Design a protein around this ligand. Sequence first.
Ligand SMILES: *CC(=O)N(C)c1cc(Oc2ccccc2OCCn2ccc(=O)[nH]c2=O)c(C)c2cc(C#N)ccc12
Lengths: 401, 547
Amino acid sequence: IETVPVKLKPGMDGPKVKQWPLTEEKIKALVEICTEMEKEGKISKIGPENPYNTPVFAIKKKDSTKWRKLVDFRELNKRTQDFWGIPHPAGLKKKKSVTVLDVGDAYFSVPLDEDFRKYTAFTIPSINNETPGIRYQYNVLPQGWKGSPAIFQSSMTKILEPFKKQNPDIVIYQYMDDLYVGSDLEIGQHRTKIEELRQHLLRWYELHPDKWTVQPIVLPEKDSWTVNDIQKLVGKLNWASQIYPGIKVRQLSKLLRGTKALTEVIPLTEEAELELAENREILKEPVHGVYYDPSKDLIAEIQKQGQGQWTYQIYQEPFKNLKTGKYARMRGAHTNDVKQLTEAVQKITTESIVIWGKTPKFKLPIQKETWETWWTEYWQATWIPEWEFVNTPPLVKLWYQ
Amino acid sequence: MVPISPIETVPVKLKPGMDGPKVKQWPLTEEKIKALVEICTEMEKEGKISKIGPENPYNTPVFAIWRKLVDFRELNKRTQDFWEVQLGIPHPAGLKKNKSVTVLDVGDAYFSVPLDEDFRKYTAFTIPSINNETPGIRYQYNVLPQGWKGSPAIFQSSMTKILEPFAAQNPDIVICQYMDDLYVGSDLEIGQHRTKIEELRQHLLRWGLTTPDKKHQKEPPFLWMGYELHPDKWTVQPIVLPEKDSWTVNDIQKLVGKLNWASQIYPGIKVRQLSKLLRGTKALTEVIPLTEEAELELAENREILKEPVHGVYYDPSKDLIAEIQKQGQGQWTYQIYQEPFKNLKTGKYARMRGAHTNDVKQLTEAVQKITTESIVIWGKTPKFKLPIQKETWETWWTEYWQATWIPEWEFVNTPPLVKLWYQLEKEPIVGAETFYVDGAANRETKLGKAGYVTNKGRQKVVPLTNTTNQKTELQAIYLALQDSGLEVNIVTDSQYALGIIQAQPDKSESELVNQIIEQLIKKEKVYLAWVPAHKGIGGNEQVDKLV
Ligand SMILES: *CC(=O)N(C)c1cc(Oc2ccccc2OCCn2ccc(=O)[nH]c2=O)c(C)c2cc(C#N)ccc12
């Protein structure tokens, strides 16, 4: 009911990002949505004196046919002054179950600071560049802007005070337009509790982090090793020796002495078996000196393993993985590589939000033009992370398979 | 007098930390001074400007051709940024055919849009007095001045706000704003069309804006931005390729510009050889000889451009189709149409700069470019016709290390067909000879060696001059491919060569890579295995090539 002064970082102008082309159905969807929002005072039309711009597009959330407006506030978010903070709940990832709730509509009940509104300008584009577009700016807290949860944090505490006082065993975290509610109850009790919380918030996505663990390096167990098997084993062990100090391969490389056929079976010597067993014992221990630094970026790498399988690693320093995983879920994307990759990016970003409270920087195994052409067609999350593109095939792919 | 509705002014500011312009007035001739006095007196009588006192410290120079020309370059440098009047040039192939298209001159409205009151003082200018014996006449603008930075955007936005209710209450017509001209198309009867034109003239008169009653100057065919727009078709303005005994740099730039421009409706235009002659050229005036490939390409272009070709307008009730053909040397051409033999438009795509490539990646990139262009022009993705078999594409994207996707498409049997030229094995080949390859080079003398040892005792080492480590690794793999049967296992330690081959190129800048590719095409089965170097892996002979 009262505006809080908001400004940009010193020396930084507002965002001026080009609006990318949109299909006719997404444009019409945005026209209906923005007309309804304008009737409700959430946005207002602006004139040519506003030069700023932030891209917009339209998505369709899970289990819903209604279109939803999504603003790409990434540039404005990095250009908006830092707000202050709350330490991340380290126990949210330790909980048995977590549920994600979209509490974005609440932001629309708080007006936005006057002099800042012009920085939230966006454009509904016209087909074939016939008009300069329909230009709007926000009057209330916009969804997707980092200032919205920071400004609404007091009101959110006031609304969640009775529920948090009633259930001290439930962890509640907020990131952007999402509310993560973790507990240890049964699935039915968790769903009834989620309906209880949503009806509690009404007056004024199953996720199980306990079923997720870090993936160790594993070596084959065979009774007959071919030359090729041993060569791949030595390659994988040499790669792992960058992560684990005492990895040893010389006894196994002794067996490769001579110019032998790749498919020829080689019996393991006793020294080779002992070396392989020592390597197994070394690989069962965690990596030495692995810590998280809140001042550094998180980096997520993804490898396509084929047959709908994808591997990923999250680290800050090379060979110091903070998280590893293997997303192989099949959900209406069996014939579309890009949709699978986009879903993997969304799941990895969610996991990163739960663990560290921020989004990682992705390295995507895809050409820039393909990704940038198609990723908005399968995006369903409120937030958007950063990404770069890998054009050279990494050799370590099969070592994560 | 009928009351005139006021036009809401746009608030304008200067760039932060900057002040208004203060440019000294050039001395003018007595004749030019008299002309500017007459013109400015008439404009003041009309209300475009007003006289101001000496307390205004700002000034902008004024010139005569008479006609008044105020040079607002300094004020433009000091004026805030505005939203663009256009985010792109419309393309004729996106226009929807109308039974009638009328043109209205709203130029007189340009001087009827008021300027922000607090900003008018920055537009001050001074007419020099005769013999400079009296103070010059001080004026300032009350409306959007011609040449000022914000005039086109404020004018277009004001006109848009004015037209919005008329366009909303008449959805059966189309109104487009372009500069000081309005274009009104409709499928109504000619009488109803002219009627709604009169209604538009009345609605504009509600703001005091005057539309010329006498017949206009623009009429089919419309000449606009290098285009001809006809009632039922569109094309580019006539493209004529000049006959030249010798070609300079600007002649080749004019020629490649004409061919690029013509390629949007004339199918099959190629510009690779002619653009290749402009490689690394710094002089606009230098003369460059024509290669024979440039002559053959130019002749093919002259044969394509011999007679006019037209594109059709867009019909949203029909499907959108885009067909692609490979032309060679990284060139691709495409046609976008809704009915067979009636193209909406055409185009081309050249491969990007790179050391290695293949036809499938290039076809993919062309598909993405056409997808984006089609979303721009028509707001939807076309159905594609591609010269590649369904099984080829499936093998490719199922086995490719990157994620890749092409939207809905169908195979069209138009050679040359895009195909996979080799596929490496997933497992070692039983019964096939195993070649352990290695190469090495001296960083100083550039002397190297490349070779192999096999499980059958076959061996080879070749000495090389003027080479590098990477070159010797590739050369070693090439030697293994040359001397092996139709099925071969190959063991290397070169992460470089594996990074190249796993990218699956079919053409390269390196002749060595191309030779390796030809050998791979000749083979039946090739398994390529990698091992770490200097790890005592027998067979992997680093010492044999370091002698
Ligand atoms: C307004 C605009 O942005 N442009 C590029 C433009 C469009 C024109 O065509 C037009 C205007 C309004 C409604 C419909 C159409 O065109 C539909 C197809 N069509 C074209 C020509 C014709 O005779 N009949 C048709 O059905 C025109 C004509 C322009 C002309 C000029 C000029 N000079 C500039 C811009 C446009």
